[PDB]
Amino acid sequence: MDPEQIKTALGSGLLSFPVTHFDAEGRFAADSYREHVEWLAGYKAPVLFAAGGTGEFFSLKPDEIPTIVAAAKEVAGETAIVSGCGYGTEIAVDIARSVEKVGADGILLLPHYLIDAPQEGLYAHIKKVCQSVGIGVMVYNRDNSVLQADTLARLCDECPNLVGFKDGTGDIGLVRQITAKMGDRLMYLGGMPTAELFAEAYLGAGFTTYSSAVFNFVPGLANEFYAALRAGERATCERILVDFFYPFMAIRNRAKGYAVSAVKAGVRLQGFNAGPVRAPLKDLTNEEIGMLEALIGTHKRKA
Amino acid sequence: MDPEQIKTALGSGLLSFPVTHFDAEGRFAADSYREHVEWLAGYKAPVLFAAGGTGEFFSLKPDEIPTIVAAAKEVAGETAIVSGCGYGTEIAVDIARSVEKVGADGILLLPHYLIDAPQEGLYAHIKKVCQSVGIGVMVYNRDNSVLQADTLARLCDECPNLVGFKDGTGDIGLVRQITAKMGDRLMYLGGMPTAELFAEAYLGAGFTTYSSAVFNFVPGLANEFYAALRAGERATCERILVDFFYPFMAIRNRAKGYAVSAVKAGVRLQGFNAGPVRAPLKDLTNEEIGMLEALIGTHKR
Amino acid sequence: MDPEQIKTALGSGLLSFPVTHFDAEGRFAADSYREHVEWLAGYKAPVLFAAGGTGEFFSLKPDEIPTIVAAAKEVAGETAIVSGCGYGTEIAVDIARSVEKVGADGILLLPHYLIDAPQEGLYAHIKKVCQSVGIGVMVYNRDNSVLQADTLARLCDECPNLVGFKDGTGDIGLVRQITAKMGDRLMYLGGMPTAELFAEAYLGAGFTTYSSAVFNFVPGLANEFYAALRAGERATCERILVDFFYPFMAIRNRAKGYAVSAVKAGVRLQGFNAGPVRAPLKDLTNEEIGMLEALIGTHKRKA
Amino acid sequence: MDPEQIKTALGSGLLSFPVTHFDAEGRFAADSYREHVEWLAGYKAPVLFAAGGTGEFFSLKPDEIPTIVAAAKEVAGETAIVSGCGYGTEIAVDIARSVEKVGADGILLLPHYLIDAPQEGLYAHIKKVCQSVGIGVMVYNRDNSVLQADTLARLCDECPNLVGFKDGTGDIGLVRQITAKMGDRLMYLGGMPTAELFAEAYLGAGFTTYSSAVFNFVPGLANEFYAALRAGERATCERILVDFFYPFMAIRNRAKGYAVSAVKAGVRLQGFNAGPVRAPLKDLTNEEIGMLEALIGTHKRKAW
């Protein structure tokens, strides 16, 4: 589909980032993946990010990305599929063209690798990756790639296929300036780890959707929080935050990387063979897994 | 008034923090201060925080604190007056008691001095201060003193006169957890130095109200933003953000401390002899003062 | 003494910062202070910092400091005495003066309160404070008060009594530039928590000496380490680090503020009546004091 | 060579990291690259790192790194050639084997990509890269990959070809702990941007040597600071810090990424056609290059 169309889809509901399934030997497990992505389909997320950060993008071989994307596409049905992209320009450009060719509906451009870079250089990097493909591009402020409002405005004026902005910084002052400056030029996506913790402040800042990583294993709970959010049903959001999200937070905050590892542990506990994380993440301990299973509780998928 | 009356007043509208006036040699300038605070109460702020952060508390002798609150009280009117408080426990207590005596309606407890501290140490600190007076306390999250939700809730149980929380961390995740937990046990105050930039997200996070530093010199514009915010006029909020606050932001970010120095310069430009900042702040250059003068423009008194 | 005399004394041996004894009701216990300090003089440190950070300057009332400094000077011997100083400019002079009038040989100017400030502002603050007295001043780079080399040079050419420089930043690049630019105009005191971990590096960076907090309770080990350091016996320095210091670090790292707390726990272990820390510090749990007692071991003071 | 041999080479002198030369179209420029590297050979650095960070590793395609290592190997002489390597485990392993295969004498393993990771994960990732090759491996503490002393011990016990440790943190407390614990099990390389600013404190902390980005364009000056350091000529070191390094430091701090861009501009100013940086770095302005050229001064290799 074309950039305005993916842009419209980005603004039509909740966004989900499927974990990437590995077998015991750490290779992509395509059968398990599709199974999980077919189950998630029944909850009608309007866009699926294939091989985002929740899907361990930063551990994928570049030649694995198009394969994971095409697996998602087989069973996604009516759902727009966006692929992770990143690294420096030369690799990002080759990934981007590889996933356009397998029918991706857009790319999510995660940060370049290792260095701190001036604004001039970011602009130069992102402009060239956007110019390498015809499909929709979402940029992604975090860690070593943080676009200022001025710089983002220049990219938008020069790159019409640039249609969205994912935030992972937590920088409220900055993202409110970005939405004021750009208005409806971009779709704004909340992208913090466990974004429901931020959804209500971000609405206020002008973000009406976010990525929900926990949708991976409790989508009905994630769909309820989202509908509560958009309906102004504040007692309901608060209940779900105190009862599920803060307790999930405390498990997540036990180790670095658990913003991905606790989520994939959740998938497995709900009966999907998602398998281990790739190093250098580590998987939850048996105790920790037990704490997660207990928390899932009434929202268990099987016995 | 008692803790619960200040609690109510704290949530009843826009809050402000008058800068502290000095003459040239350096001492507090009571006549000027009184004439500035009186002009502010006229723009109907419910609460006024004398010698707070914006009022250069961090640069004030313990002895000076009661004189400033006293000055403010003389001309406040219906507006309630909350006093800055701070430093280590021993000095904080002494300051707390001194301002209660001159009739402070409340304390804003700024962080202790220098050290990092464990949560259990912060608990002891803040407890000891709350218990030394009978008026209401507002704690203040920023820098080397950041209360976690559970620690905070322990204080709220232990100390019924702790009625308010001010944020200056911008940690939007932490403060939504704090409101979600404590609920109506506390009033929640937006406290970033230029809080209009954070006010729409703060209210999403459940925040009762926020404080406007720039109210010091453009109270009419602060009040404009504030009413549009409460009535949901996103586009008016947005115009005032783009035309005034982000340009103010670009002046403030030119130097450290200018969250105070540029507000103060703002006040001088409107005809109040606020005098300079005390070291180690520095005043705006003549260039920067003119930038700010140009930006105030139509609101010029 | 005059400023050049405390300068001299400062670079002539190993410095330390005695903890302040409080009785359990919370007041300064000058009896135990003198009995603790008397014991430390016998281990021959040439300058002594009364009411500094290790001595909880940050929790002291401005009135308690001359009292503490006097309590120190009485049993000090010919050992020199430097007082803490700090907070805003206005409180800082009041404190500086008050401690000069009770014989303080000099002053350690801890950072101002709370705010970040511009270099020019740090300059006006420190300048005025140096000019309020006639005894020697040593500046202290940490947290919200970090002087760049050019600023520090300016203060040195304005205030002849400013003669020492304590680092608490751990910034090698900066303090090497300070010692290269300033030369022997300043005496450079290594000032990290548990500065021994840092001493071998700070010598290479041009630092005359450092302060030992653990001198407080194991001043035998402190002189053994300092001595080996100066004679170039690396294998002996390295022993005491692997055997004492990285274990003491693992305890000190259990909690915020334990850079003082674990030190004041060590003092009470050797049997001095130090008593509690003042909030917002806390004391080590008994389990932790047990940990500490096992580590002090052979060095435990004996009747 | 084998790992102990590269360990020895690493310990034996000043080390350097050549910039990677690109033509105007951003492609690898090998004629210019080997020309520059032949010059660096005259100054006898015992180890050369091809496609390290100063060499813009983080902007190279993996298929480019072997070609770069082979180019430098043509004209390096008896200098050890070590290859950059990095990203996450799968890519890192591939790069490692590709450069082993073109004859690299070791690899320097830059951090994995993007994420903060627990110590157990770093252990697992690094162990797997080391096990993929027979050549010597140097680990590199910086940014999102900072090994503790106890983790590195466990890697050292498990991976005999892991022989070196490069520091990019400036965390003196932690790097002293690491040398105290590991001893001569490892050689220690100082690796801060503009490491001369740090060299004297790092030896004190027991670091076997360091690497000099600026040696790219004033090797003569870098060699003399290095000999002065090893002979304890403090005054000589200090004159070179005040006259050249802090001034270079003021140029380098004008923009992010100029720890690499300022160095490449220096190479260009000495008549080696290094070409531009790849985004997201940016090149010094014409003005800034002017500042650099005046600073180089008496150390010019050419007249234009």
Ligand SMILES: *[C@@H](CCCC(=O)O)C(=O)O
């Ligand atoms: C972005 C989505 C982050 C969601 C979360 O961590 O909870 C991504 O994975 O790329």
Ligand SMILES: *[C@@H](CCCC(=O)O)C(=O)O
């Ligand atoms: C808290 C921040 C208030 C800023 C304002 O005046 O609105 C303080 O200054 O103490």
Ligand SMILES: *[C@@H](CCCC(=O)O)C(=O)O
């Ligand atoms: C490490 C060399 C660092 C030297 C410098 O930046 O000055 C690398 O490039 O891999």
Ligand SMILES: *[C@H](CCCC(=O)O)C(=O)O
């Ligand atoms: C100086 C810091 C000494 C800390 C240590 O060696 O642990 C001070 O307290 O003022």
